[PDB]
Amino acid sequence: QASVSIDAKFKAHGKKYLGTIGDQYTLTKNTKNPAIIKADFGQLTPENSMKWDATEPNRGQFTFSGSDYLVNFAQSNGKLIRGHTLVWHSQLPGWVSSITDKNTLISVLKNHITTVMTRYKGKIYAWDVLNEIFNEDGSLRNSVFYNVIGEDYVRIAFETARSVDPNAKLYINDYNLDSAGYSKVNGMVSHVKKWLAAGIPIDGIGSQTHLGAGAGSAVAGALNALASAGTKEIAITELDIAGASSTDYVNVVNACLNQAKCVGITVWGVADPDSWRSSSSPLLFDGNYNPKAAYNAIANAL
Numbered sequence: 001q002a003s004v005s006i007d008a009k010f011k012a013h014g015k016k017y018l019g020t021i022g023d024q025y026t027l028t029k030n031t032k033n034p035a036i037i038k039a040d041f042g043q044l045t046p047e048n049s050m051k052w053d054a055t056e057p058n059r060g061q062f063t064f065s066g067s068d069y070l071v072n073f074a075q076s077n078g079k080l081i082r083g084h085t086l087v088w089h090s091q092l093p094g095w096v097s098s099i100t101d102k103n104t105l106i107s108v109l110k111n112h113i114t115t116v117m118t119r120y121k122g123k124i125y126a127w128d129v130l131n132e133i134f135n136e137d138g139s140l141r142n143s144v145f146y147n148v149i150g151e152d153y154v155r156i157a158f159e160t161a162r163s164v165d166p167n168a169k170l171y172i173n174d175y176n177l178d179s180a181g182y183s184k185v186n187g188m189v190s191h192v193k194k195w196l197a198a199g200i201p202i203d204g205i206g207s208q209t210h211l212g213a214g215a216g217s218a219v220a221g222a223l224n225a226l227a228s229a230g231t232k233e234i235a236i237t238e239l240d241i242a243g244a245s246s247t248d249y250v251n252v253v254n255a256c257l258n259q260a261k262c263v264g265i266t267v268w269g270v271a272d273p274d275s276w277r278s279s280s281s282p283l284l285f286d287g288n289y290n291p292k293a294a295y296n297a298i299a300n301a302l
């Protein structure tokens with residue numbers, strides 16, 4: 001645990017949280033990791049426990065052991081929770097992707113959103129209702145949901161989410177929304193404008209922000225472009241930067257800090273060894289679970 005909480009300092013600027021992720025294993029593999037989370041971060045996103053494959057492995061049969069643990073840990077420690085993720089083409093059981101009948105997929109989609117959301121009704125700050133639905137060119141990804149239901153699945157997912165838990169902020173999340181002018185950003189902005197204009201309840205846009213070295217300075221403009229979609233808020237949902245340089249991390253923090261719609265930042269992991277991109281050392285804490293330079297730099301900029 002770092003003596004200075006970057007979460008506490010970010011919140012001091014009117015922001016809602018600067019969080020990270022977790023699940024049973026990383027919350028118990030040692031004493032330092034959970035201690036870092038409780039001291040320096042104020043929000044948690046389950047790393048894998050809330051996804052389709054982990055929650056509904058078989059049609060109509062749910063498994064909530066992992067997600068229960070993550071939610072309970074967060075709630076027991078005053079951590080805001082971001083549900084992740086309801087509708088996605090990756091980590092999706094084969095029984096879903098094999099469905100060809102429209103009405104049958106709609107029934108399934110709604111049952112999954114309803115059961116997973118109902119179980120944590122009132123405890124979830126935000127839900128990533130839809131994840132990675134765009135192709136790099138800004139067009140809709142031909143996932144099973146898109147191929148079988150059509151564009152209407154977007155309305156269906158959000159409208160089900162809204163009615164089931166009107167307390168959660170409904171988000172559409174995606175990666176590569178990292179520079180103004182990029183085709184995917186334009187595609188995300190134009191589609192959300194259209195969807196909001198039609199009455200679809202999309203409260204926020206989540207930008208993953210999985211960066212390479214040197215990509216930090218462009219994030220500010222990306223957030224500015226996304227703000228044009230017209231959503232109530234936006235957020236950096238899965239932040240990590242190869243090399244974890246102070247320049248890149250501070251640039252990303254300032255990008256959010258200086259944009260009024262950006263409510264928070266979630267670092268996709270606490271320490272490097274537990275990162276999904278571990279070979280690049282893209283996190284704020286090192287192999288010894290000690291604050292790296294970026295963590296202190298982020299602290300001194302707030």
Ligand SMILES: O[C@@H]1[C@@H](O)[C@@H](O)OC[C@H]1O
Pocket residue numbers: 048049053054091
């Ligand atoms: O629950 C996740 C599952 O998809 C597994 O296959 O890969 C990592 C796990 O945490």
Ligand SMILES: O[C@@H]1[C@@H](O)[C@H](O)OC[C@H]1O
Pocket residue numbers: 068071072119120
């Ligand atoms: O519904 C309960 C859920 O809200 C809690 O988080 O974990 C245990 C479940 O029984």
Ligand SMILES: O[C@@H]1[C@@H](O)[C@H](O)OC[C@H]1O
Pocket residue numbers: 175176208210
């Ligand atoms: O899905 C991957 C995304 O998470 C990463 O940021 O960039 C490469 C993609 O394939």
Ligand SMILES: O[C@@H]1[C@@H](O)[C@H](O)OC[C@H]1O
Pocket residue numbers: 047048276
């Ligand atoms: O643990 C990994 C998770 O961080 C990533 O988001 O999805 C793939 C998983 O293997």
